[PDB]
Design a protein around this ligand. Structure first.
Ligand SMILES: *[C@@H]1O[C@H](CO)[C@@H](O)[C@H](O)[C@H]1NC(C)=O
Ligand SMILES: *[C@@H]1O[C@H](CO)[C@@H](O)[C@H](O)[C@H]1NC(C)=O
Ligand SMILES: *[C@@H]1O[C@H](CO)[C@@H](O)[C@H](O)[C@H]1NC(C)=O
Ligand SMILES: *[C@@H]1O[C@H](CO)[C@@H](O)[C@H](O)[C@H]1NC(C)=O
Lengths: 162, 162
């Protein structure tokens, strides 16, 4: 299996992601998205693109990306600080169940995987999530995929932020 | 007029603030909240307090505070990185109108004002907002209140983030 052959799942309407906030990452590829909370935001009233925004929050640091739909269930991200472009797909989504929400999303460079983000608001207890992670590990460079919360900083009274 | 005598307005249910996301600050007191976007987040499914969170995002830096209700329409904030406590009130709110949402919130130390945050998603065009700012300026230390967006960094393709 190669990264280009992973499923490209249907993308839920943006409100279903917003209603899932906050999420934490369970499995990631690089160190970048360890100990990170995901927040979805609807488009600003003054946005001319009317693109929603994904926020990746790691302690007191934040990456933001406006994103629009592309071909074949792709998400086309514009990193808000640099203008850098990224193309993402979903392996699966399972939002707004009786046990909360989860999904796994990935970024390819051709046949190899270069980033992975499995998110949930149920501490990784959706059986689809571990299953998806085990499939993603089998594509080239998927060996890097690992648990995102092994050594996070201590909290100071909140639950999704530190 | 002193800070303790400012109105303590009724606080809209949290979902009305979330539905207003994203907001930008129009008037602030210190430099801290210049060029800042406000995002409200519902409580995490795993939060034992079930407190919502306010996010103050300034470029790639973020302050987060879980907050709960207190006496006399107060908001009791817990800054998520430090555990520091703050008490806030609303001068007014005007959420989810045909021209969007605005509010002004303030933090006192007794008779003086020590921080001010007027937010909107309509570029400060609610007439209540400039009116409220003019009242807040009249309390001790209100002379510091000023426009929050005079010199913000250039954007790179997004609208509420940079
Ligand atoms: C993909 O890999 C190629 C090397 O052939 C490189 O030119 C390019 O920068 C890579 N793109 C990303 C997004 O990693
Ligand atoms: C979340 O899951 C991990 C096991 O992977 C466990 O260490 C931790 O106790 C869980 N957290 C809660 C709040 O149950
Ligand atoms: C309020 O002012 C007093 C000085 O009398 C000081 O002890 C205290 O730290 C101040 N509190 C805040 C939150 O600024
Ligand atoms: C927002 O308001 C200021 C005037 O206070 C103005 O400079 C700017 O053009 C306005 N922005 C838009 C998009 O209309």
């Amino acid at each position: 299996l190669t990264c280009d052959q992973l499923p490209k799942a249907a993308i839920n309407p943006i409100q279903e992601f917003i209603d899932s906030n906050p999420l934490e990452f369970e499995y990631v590829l690089t160190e970048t998205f360890e100990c990170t909370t995901r927040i979805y935001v609807q488009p600003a009233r003054w946005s001319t693109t009317k693109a929603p925004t994904a926020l990746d929050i790691k302690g007191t640091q934040i990456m933001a990306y406006d994103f629009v739909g592309g071909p074949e269930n792709s998400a086309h991200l514009n990193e808000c600080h640099t203008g850098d472009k990224q193309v993402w797909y979903f392996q699966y989504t399972n939002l707004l169940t009786d046990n909360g929400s989860s999904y796994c999303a990935y970024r390819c460079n051709g046949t190899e995987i270069i980033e992975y983000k499995c998110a949930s608001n149920n501490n990784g207890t959706d059986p689809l999530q571990h299953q998806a992670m085990e499939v993603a590990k089998t594509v080239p460079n998927g060996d890097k995929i690992h648990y995102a919360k092994s050594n996070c900083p201590e909290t100071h009274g909140c639950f999704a932020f530190y």
